């Protein structure tokens, strides 16, 4: 993530830039990726001044071709947050991949919710054990997010609880629009400090409740922005979807199918996933987060 | 194709010419095809000097008549990368035709994505089997491009994978504009080495809010450039359009349109809706881990 | 069409004339119609030698008054290529008139393209059935011309296909200028052998893509040259225009409005046309060319 | 008008005179009006012999003063072919005035063409209704002259059509020059029989590349000849100019200018922009299958 | 103006004189000014008889020296026709001066034509209001003279229109020669009745159309004759020249430059003019002739 | 100068003499210079009586030799009215020389007219500043003489205007002949009072048709008379010739020729083309409301 401050060169003022922040951009990436028009329309950005930026950011953020093999290197040298279950990680190839969206879907109470939570912490863990050493943005749509249940997990991984929670940004989205108003405001934040993973749970449900078509745009438009944020900040996005489901599949590179196992075990497939192989395997749920049987 | 470097003659300097590269042109063809105006506008190009070029390129690239039959031959001798499915090829009259744009459209996950990959490889395949022996330019707008899934395909057709991949230019476009800034940088490439197919997936990002009228208009300016490059380089351009002026700007500018619908399981239907020569007719194909294929 | 060779008399040498060919002229008509200046500027044509030509051609090509009624005779004794649809011909008064431009316009895929093709063949047909026994110059701007689809049509009319195609001059125009560079080079040809009809499709579209004013001159200038060629060689020019549109109307004597009928039928008007009466009527499209329902 | 044949007197031979025809002149008027020089230049015309002519024609055609009022009478007694539309005539103060050139200009398809046709016939109409009882000279530069469309008009005014048509000299000019070579041949005609109006449509072909300065200059040399013939023969000259020095060479040399704009449907507006006598004022007219008319 | 009849004395017969009229002369002035030779060549005028005339007229028409100051008196006691615009007259020192040529020049349609017309009437007006109580000779070269537009002006000044027009001699000059054949015939007339002003409009234009040198003589020769006529009859000559231009300046004592103002106003300078001061000022044009804004 | 009245002695009567005035002579000089014949022809002049005159005038006006140097002095002591422009005077070696004719020629409006005016006044100016203290004879052929424009000049040099003007004899000549009839009447004047310069503008009216040979010849007979008067009276003769034998009759008979060309704005070039003493050399001057001057 290249802060915008690095674009203050060869004629760009922290004041021009400032006009970008309040405009929406929050990283070279932003600029770089931002459409030309979208800079022209910022009051005060000169059609010439705009070209000076795009040109600059483009020097700090790769906007170029690369052999396809060459691509594949830069991709795999990516950090992998951990589930908490050997059997599960082993199936994910180490764990939830960052830079990309990863969709968790299944029937109610099949052990999705439960995993985000865990993940919501193992993303604070030291790279060597599994984590990502970054904070966490947790977007909760339903209303089921209770912090209380995280201590028990943090503990398992050793982390001053009341401190580990101060390490988690919580948002309750009340309407599908809102759910995007936030994404912006969460960049302003992934800008200031360093996060390791975002979790929207559940991307959908707010979209049913509160035509289709229209809906089906709003949604996409979201899955995109999320995607972006992953490119923009290197985080790991995890989205749950409880049984439109394409619009996600599309923009989600890892899909993970959960089924209700026996008692408190839970089966779970890797259904369609670029590199990985279609293999199910069992995991389970305790009082301290996901884990092995 | 004829590199611009060949126009450096009888007065034309590599410095004149460079003024043409940064202008847009990247092949004799380009110059040739280029309207007159379009050269005079170039800062530095003398109304006389321009005449000197248009006249030179025209000597290196035809643009004259030919009998119709004479024409129809040339058209058959022309390459056609292959889908991977007899039933499908058989429908396309052998495969995706080069020199023209070919549009693959349908609802999400109906088999388009899958195809481009395959096609992404079959373009490196020897003419006799089905390929084009050329590299491949792939412009990815969504972000769902993962190379890993090409080995399995390459293997299917026998090719040192970590070698085939080094045989594929990948670009992820982040903004409607950029999607265009690339095309140009991609000519500078198809100039240096020889490519067989271009794939933009999906062009219809041009419609995202990153008015209508305007957007409808960019999507043309693009589709045209694309088409151009197909003229310029002989390649084969394949564009997906995902349903989820609009579908028209397409319709007009594309030469072959192919609609995809979700079959039962991993089978997938697919019509040849609208296409000059070809007859309207659907058929089924299917999807596996090493790429498209028959059922 | 009086070949230029007939001007080799009373002091004109095949060598003077030759200096005309490479200059542009390709028929007495050419000369006759050619401006005085335009001969003077040919290097080697003597202001006296020039007058000797103009004077001569003028003896072979009528450049004179005629009662207006008298005109009307020489006009109607003109050959008429056929559409392939009784209902359609019947509306055109027999079919597309030669010597004049005839504009086919309508919305995309309303059965224009389809007709040129047909026409592109019925112009090889024997006068008694409908045709013009001449070849065909087909200028295609778009890129949609596929010969393959002509056999099926030729067949319908009986014509050694691979032979009927050898009977069609194909040009792909890449830039509006080019589109005129050709017209010249197509005279050199309508000079050598005998053609029955020209088809530029679509005169416009290359003019939008690749100010107005300037454009609006270039265009006219074209519609003119076409017109000329019709006077010069007696052919039939057919131009499609897909929905500046005046510049054509003006220089086009027959205008024919196509609308999309039901299924594969296609309605079509005779909108403004000298002699004929404003009457619509339906036709249709098959695999072997235009035809009746 | 006074045919040259009348100058064959007191020495002047039909052979002297013929030397004047092939020179340009075709009427006493011509000779009369002709500058002196312009006769001396004629190979064969003796500085003395010329004096003998200028002196003779001047006896057959006045060119002297007259009171102004005396003048203004003559001007009213003068014919005025009619448009076909009360509203329009009423605007032109009765119709197109003879003896002068009258310019009809406007964008393509704004009703000019249409008018000339009508006018092309109303000039054969009996003075009492509106006509001029004369034939018509029509010089067509474009190629859009189709007689067929005159019957319908002739009929409207009652005239054996295949008879009215034989009452119209048609010329298609193919080159700027030729347009002039004709005017002369057209005098030889207006000499033999009696014509009522000339129509060149459109004079402004004189501007096509079949420099400017030069072209601007020819368009005058022409407009003047035209004007001349109006003097020479009493006719009425009507020129269209299609928009699509230039519009000035016009402006100066034309006596009545009329601008046409496209009304709603088949109605058509039309101003009297600039004209000695007449007042600036627009009005609407309209177009049908048998020619101009009111709405 | 001394009529020739006054030379019938001490041996001159109305018959000798008659031989002068048909010869060209039309006033003592004529004779007086006429070259000796030009009387000798009149068939019947005796080299002695000729001297008897020259000698006589010279007694009726001043042909002598005068102090220069003395001149200046006889000049200013001259009548001044009026423009119709206070601002304009005020700039002309009362209006167009008589006895002398006054050139009106400017670009097409800059309000020249329009003024002659007016002037063409205010020269019938009673000396006390502005006019000259004389008739008007109007030589029109172009063809733009329509009497109709004069009533409206005459009216403004009160004058039986159909009567005021009977008070104007109109000539249409078709060739530069002609334009002088007239001048003579207009003397025969300014001889019979009394005129107040001549207007040739435009002295030039007929001279371009229908070498230079030759031209440039013919012209001068004219501007002279006009001048003369002004001496000969006391009239006011007004000539328009629309933008050789020296040949006029020279023989024109008042030059007046017109420029196109805004709407229907018209600016106008007094560019070089003996007595007067170089001062521009605005006037305007209506339906009843020149006038003030 | 010596008035003829002085010859009334030893027999010569004012009546003899009058017979000489009406004959042409108006000064001893005249008589003196007069060829013998030219007196014998005078009706009344006895071959003996004439001898008595020629002998008397010769006593009052020299006509004998003098050394050359002796001559060249006299020539410097001689007056020179002034142009009004240092640069110009400096070119004429002080100004327009008296005793000789000085020709000012050039295209219309090139500054000649302007000059004569000025000169028309500077001739009334005190010797010490530049003038000649004499009146001025101005013969105007064109008709463009307006006094009004002399005040402004007179003022420039300080002179009660309505007084300076009464110090200028104006003649408008209407016919080639008359132009001559005047010269004579103008001697009767330069006899009575003392004048400093004569100005005929423009002599070359002598060429208007109010043959050639003849006209060429009159223009001399004139130029000579002029020259004469310069002998006779000491004045300074200035003639303009406007371009618009001919230019030769001039050339031969004029002593100083000055060519004028139109400078930029109101500046004006002017060469000393051909003149005995003076060197060929141009220079610039300029024109204002109070007469000639420097730039």
Query: Whole-angstrom Cα distance, residue E292 to residue E87?
Result: 7
Least CB–CB distance from A246: residue in B109, B143, B167: B109
Tokens 């009329």 belong to D258
For chain D, the distance separating the N- and C-terminal CA atoms, rounded to the nearest angstrom, is 39
- Please report the residues numbered 243 through 282 in chain F whose beta carbons come closer than 8 angstroms to any beta carbon of chain E: 244
In whole angstroms, what separates CA C145 from the centre of its chain? 18
B119 and B221 co-located in one domain: yes
Q: How far is CA E148 from CA D69, D71, D103, E161, F12, in A?
A: 9, 10, 21, 10, 76
Alpha helix locations (H) across chain E?
14-21, 28-33, 37-40, 47-60, 68-76, 86-92, 112-119, 148-157, 161-164, 178-185, 187-192, 206-209, 213-233, 246-251
Tell whether D73 is within 8 A of chain E (Cβ).
no
Residue F181 Ramachandran class (φ > 0 left, ψ -120 to 50 alpha, else beta): alpha
A217 and A247 co-located in one domain: yes
Tell whether C213 is within 8 A of chain B (Cβ).
no
Task: Specify the pairing of strand A195-201 against strand A237-242.
Answer: parallel
Q: Give the bridge partners for A283, in sequence order.
A: A266
Tell whether F176 is within 8 A of chain E (Cβ).
yes
Q: Residues D27, D2: contact at Cβ < 8 Å?
A: yes
Residue among D205, D210, D214 with most chain C CBs within 10 A, to mutate: D210
Tell whether F221 is within 8 A of chain E (Cβ).
no
Query: Whole-angstrom Cα distance, residue E234 to residue E252?
Result: 15
Subunit contact E144:D276, Cβ cutoff 8 A: yes
Q: How far is CA D184 from CA D18, D25, F282, in A?
A: 14, 9, 55
Here the tokens at position E220 are 């001068």
D1 and D130 co-located in one domain: no
F27 and F119 co-located in one domain: no
Cβ neighbours of F162 in E, within 8 Å: 69
Cβ neighbours of C174 in B, within 8 Å: 32-33, 63, 231
Tell whether D22 is within 8 A of chain C (Cβ).
no
For chain B, the distance separating the N- and C-terminal CA atoms, rounded to the nearest angstrom, is 39
Q: Write the CATH number for A268.
A: 3.40.50.300
Task: Specify the pairing of strand E290-291 against strand F80-81.
Answer: unpaired
Q: How far is CA D116 from CA A186, A212, C166, D132, D145, in A?
A: 74, 61, 46, 15, 11
Subunit contact B277:C185, Cβ cutoff 8 A: no
Tokens 């929207």 belong to A200
Rg (CA), chain E: 20
Phi, psi of F99 (to 5 degrees): 80, -15
D16 and D136 co-located in one domain: no
Residue D128 DSSP class: T
Subunit contact E34:F175, Cβ cutoff 8 A: yes
Residue D114 DSSP class: H
Q: How many Cα atoms within 13 Å fall on the side-chain side of residue D279? A: 8
State the chains in contact with C (3 or more Cβ–Cβ pairs under 8 Å). B, D
Do D and B touch, 3+ Cβ pairs within 8 Å? The answer is: no
Query: Whole-angstrom Cα distance, residue D46 to residue D58?
Result: 18
Q: Residues B202, B142: contact at Cβ < 8 Å?
A: yes
Q: Is the peptide bond preceding residue D121 cis, with omega within 30 degrees of 0?
A: no
Of C184, C181, C195, whose CA–CA distance to B63 is shortest?
C181
Q: How far is CA C121 from CA A152, C118, C201, C257, in A?
A: 85, 5, 16, 22
Other beta carbons within 10 angstroms of residue A109's beta carbon come to: 12
Query: Whole-angstrom Cα distance, residue C262 to residue A225?
Result: 44
D133 and D244 co-located in one domain: yes
Count residue pairs from E and F with Cβ separation < 8 A.
Answer: 93
Q: Residues C138, B68: contact at Cβ < 8 Å?
A: yes
C209 and C66 co-located in one domain: no
Here the tokens at position D278 are 């007449």
Tell whether C151 is within 8 A of chain B (Cβ).
no
Q: How far is CA C18 from CA C4, C6, F214, F225, in A?
A: 9, 12, 61, 73
Supply the range of the domain harboring residue F85.
73-295
Residue among B72, B94, B249, B273 with most chain C CBs within 10 A, to mutate: B72
Least CB–CB distance from A69: residue in B165, B176, B242: B165
Query: Whole-angstrom Cα distance, residue C109 to residue B257?
Result: 14
Do B and A touch, 3+ Cβ pairs within 8 Å? The answer is: yes
Which residue, D17, D50, D72, sits at the end of a domain? D72
Subunit contact D67:E148, Cβ cutoff 8 A: no
Of C52, C129, C99, C60, whose CA–CA distance to C196 is shortest?
C99
Do F and B touch, 3+ Cβ pairs within 8 Å? The answer is: no
Q: Residues D277, D286: contact at Cβ < 8 Å?
A: no
Other beta carbons within 10 angstroms of residue E270's beta carbon come to: 19
Q: Which residues contact F18 (CB under 8 A, 6 or more apart)?
A: none
Tokens 């009086």 belong to C2
Query: Whole-angstrom Cα distance, residue D180 to residue D223?
Result: 10
D285 and D140 co-located in one domain: yes
- Please report the residues numbered 108 through 147 in chain E whose beta carbons come closer than 8 angstroms to any beta carbon of chain F: none
Q: Residues E150, D68: contact at Cβ < 8 Å?
A: yes
E190 and E77 co-located in one domain: yes
Here the tokens at position E132 are 């000259």
Which residue, E44, E72, E100, sits at the end of a domain? E72
Q: Which residues contact C89 (CB under 8 A, 6 or more apart)?
A: C80, C82, C83, C95, C130
Query: Whole-angstrom Cα distance, residue E211 to residue A268?
Result: 107
Here the tokens at position C178 are 């080019």
Cβ neighbours of B174 in A, within 8 Å: 32-33, 63, 231
Query: Whole-angstrom Cα distance, residue D53 to residue A66?
Result: 94
Q: Write the CATH number for F55.
A: 1.10.150.20
Query: Whole-angstrom Cα distance, residue D272 to residue A15?
Result: 60
Here the tokens at position F88 are 């110009």
Residue among D110, D117, D141, D172 with most chain C CBs within 10 A, to mutate: D172
Subunit contact D186:C65, Cβ cutoff 8 A: yes
Residue among E106, E110, E160, E172 with most chain D CBs within 10 A, to mutate: E172
Subunit contact B277:C148, Cβ cutoff 8 A: yes
Q: Binding residue per annotation — D46?
A: no
Q: Binding residue per annotation — D261?
A: no
Count residue pairs from C and D with Cβ separation < 8 A.
Answer: 93
Residue among D69, D219, D232 with most chain E CBs within 10 A, to mutate: D69
Rg (CA), chain D: 20
Cβ neighbours of B149 in A, within 8 Å: 274-275
Alpha helix locations (H) across chain A?
14-21, 28-33, 37-40, 47-60, 68-76, 86-92, 112-119, 148-157, 161-164, 178-185, 187-192, 206-209, 213-233, 246-251
Here the tokens at position F58 are 């010769």
Structural domain count, chain C: 2
Q: Residue D176's closest chain C neighbor by CA?
A: C35
Q: Residue E73's closest chain F neighbor by CA?
A: F147
Cβ neighbours of D149 in C, within 8 Å: 274-275
If 0-12 CB within 10 Å is exposed, 13-18 middle and 19+ buried, where does residue F289 land? exposed
Shortest Cα–Cα distance, B96 to chain C (Å): 16
State the chains in contact with B (3 or more Cβ–Cβ pairs under 8 Å). A, C
C23 and C81 co-located in one domain: no
Query: Whole-angstrom Cα distance, residue D62 to residue D70?
Result: 14
Of B60, B61, B56, whose CA–CA distance to B10 is shortest?
B56
Query: Whole-angstrom Cα distance, residue E96 to residue E94?
Result: 7
Least CB–CB distance from C209: residue in B64, B70, B224: B224
* CA trace torsion F67, F68, F70, F74 (10° rounding): 140
Measured in residues, chain A has a length of: 293
Cβ neighbours of B244 in A, within 8 Å: 216-217, 220, 247
Cited resolution, angstroms: 3.2
Residue numbers after which chain A is interrupted (C to N above 2.5 A) read: 210, 243
Task: Specify the pairing of strand A237-242 against strand A101-106.
Answer: parallel
Q: Give the bridge partners for E201, in sequence order.
A: E140, E240
Least CB–CB distance from F210: residue in E38, E217, E275: E38
Tell whether C204 is within 8 A of chain B (Cβ).
no
Q: How far is CA E286 from CA E91, E242, E264, in A?
A: 20, 21, 8
C215 and C123 co-located in one domain: yes
Cβ neighbours of E35 in F, within 8 Å: 175-177, 210
Of F200, F131, F203, F206, whose CA–CA distance to F170 is shortest?
F200
B99 and B26 co-located in one domain: no
Rg (CA), chain A: 20
Q: Residues E87, E292: contact at Cβ < 8 Å?
A: yes
CA C155, C159, C163, C169 dihedral sign is negative
Tell whether D193 is within 8 A of chain C (Cβ).
no
Q: Binding residue per annotation — C191?
A: no
Least CB–CB distance from A71: residue in B144, B147, B209: B147
Of E130, E134, E113, whose CA–CA distance to E195 is shortest?
E134
Subunit contact D182:C65, Cβ cutoff 8 A: yes
Subunit contact C68:D146, Cβ cutoff 8 A: no
The SS3 of residue A283 is strand
Rg (CA), chain B: 20
Query: Whole-angstrom Cα distance, residue F119 to residue F122?
Result: 5
Phi, psi of E99 (to 5 degrees): 80, -15
Three-class SS string for chain C?
CCCHHHHCCCCCCHHHHHHHHCCCCCCHHHHHHCCCHHHHCCCCCCHHHHHHHHHHHHHHCCCCCCEHHHHHHHHHCCCEECCCCHHHHHHHCCCEECCCEEEEEECCCCCHHHHHHHHCCCCCCCCCCCCCCCEEEEEECCCCCCCHHHHHHHHHHCCCHHHHHHHCEEEECCCCCHHHHHHHHCHHHHHHCCEEEEEEECCCCHHHHCCCHHHHHHHHHHHHHHHHHHHHHCCCEEEEEECCCHHHHHHCCEEEEEEECCCCEEEEEECCCCCCCCCCCCEEECCCCEECC
Q: Which residues contact F165 (CB under 8 A, 6 or more apart)?
A: E67, E68, E69, E72, F147, F150, F151, F154
Here the tokens at position E69 are 């100051």
Subunit contact C168:B67, Cβ cutoff 8 A: yes
Q: Which residues contact B240 (CB under 8 A, 6 or more apart)?
A: B103, B104, B105, B112, B113, B116, B200, B201, B202, B203, B204
Q: Give the bridge partners for A268, in sequence order.
A: A258
Q: Residues C133, C126: contact at Cβ < 8 Å?
A: yes
Task: Specify the pairing of strand C290-291 against strand A101-106.
Answer: unpaired
Task: Specify the pairing of strand F101-106 against strand D135-140.
Answer: unpaired
Q: Residues A251, A238: contact at Cβ < 8 Å?
A: no
Task: Specify the pairing of strand F256-262 against strand F267-271.
Answer: antiparallel
Residue F196 DSSP class: E
Of C255, C262, C271, C176, whose CA–CA distance to C220 is shortest?
C176
Here the tokens at position C134 are 């001449």
Q: How far is CA E48 from CA A235, B254, D192, F43, F258, in A?
A: 129, 107, 57, 19, 42
Q: Which residues contact F206 (CB under 8 A, 6 or more apart)?
A: F176, F179, F215, F218, F219, F222
Shortest Cα–Cα distance, B49 to chain C (Å): 17
The DSSP secondary structure of D26-48, one letter per residue, reads -SHHHHHHS-SHHHHTSTT--HH
Of F78, F146, F86, F157, whose CA–CA distance to F124 is shortest?
F157
CA C218, C220, C223, C225 dihedral sign is negative
Here the tokens at position B15 are 């410095």
Here the tokens at position C55 are 């004077």
Subunit contact E251:F144, Cβ cutoff 8 A: yes
Give buried/exposed letters for C132-142 (b at 16+ CB in 10 A, else e).
Answer: bebbbbbbbbb
Tokens 């008399």 belong to C9
Query: Whole-angstrom Cα distance, residue B80 to residue B69?
Result: 20
Which residue, F40, F72, F104, sits at the end of a domain? F72
Tell whether C215 is within 8 A of chain D (Cβ).
no
Measured in residues, chain E has a length of: 293
Shortest Cα–Cα distance, B154 to chain A (Å): 13
Other beta carbons within 10 angstroms of residue B201's beta carbon come to: 24
């Amino acid at each position: 993530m290249v802060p915008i401050e690095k674009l203050q060169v060869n004629g760009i003022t922290m004041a021009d830039v400032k006009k970008l922040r309040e405009s929406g951009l929050h990283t070279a990436e932003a600029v770089a990726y931002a459409p030309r028009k979208d800079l022209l329309e910022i009051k005060g950005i000169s059609e010439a001044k705009a070209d000076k930026l795009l040109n600059e950011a483009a020097r700090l953020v790769p906007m170029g071709f690369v052999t396809a093999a060459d691509f594949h290197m830069r991709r795999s040298e990516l950090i992998c947050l951990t589930t908490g279950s050997k059997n599960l990680d082993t199936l994910l190839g180490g764990g939830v991949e960052t830079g990309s969206i990863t969709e968790l879907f299944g029937e109610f109470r099949t052990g999705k919710s439960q995993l985000c939570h865990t993940l919501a912490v193992t993303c604070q863990i030291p790279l060597d054990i599994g984590g990502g050493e970054g904070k966490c943005l947790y977007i909760d749509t339903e209303g089921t997010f209770r912090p209380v249940r995280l201590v028990s997990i943090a503990q398992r991984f050793g982390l001053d609880p009341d401190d580990a929670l101060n390490n988690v940004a919580y948002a309750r989205a009340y309407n599908a629009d809102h759910q995007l108003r936030l994404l912006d405001a969460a960049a302003q934040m992934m800008s200031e400090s360093r996060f390791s993973l975002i979790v929207v749970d559940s991307v959908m449900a707010l979209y049913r409740t509160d035509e289709l078509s229209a809906r089906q745009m709003h949604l996409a438009k979201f899955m995109r922005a999320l995607q972006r944020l992953a490119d923009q900040f290197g985080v790991a996005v995890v989205v749950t979807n409880q049984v439109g489901g394409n619009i996600m599949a599309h923009s989600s590179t890892t899909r993970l199918g959960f089924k209700k196992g026996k008692g408190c075990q839970r089966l779970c497939k890797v259904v369609d996933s670029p590199c990985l192989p279609e293999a199910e395997c069992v995991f389970a749920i305790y009082e301290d987060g996901v884990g092995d049987p």
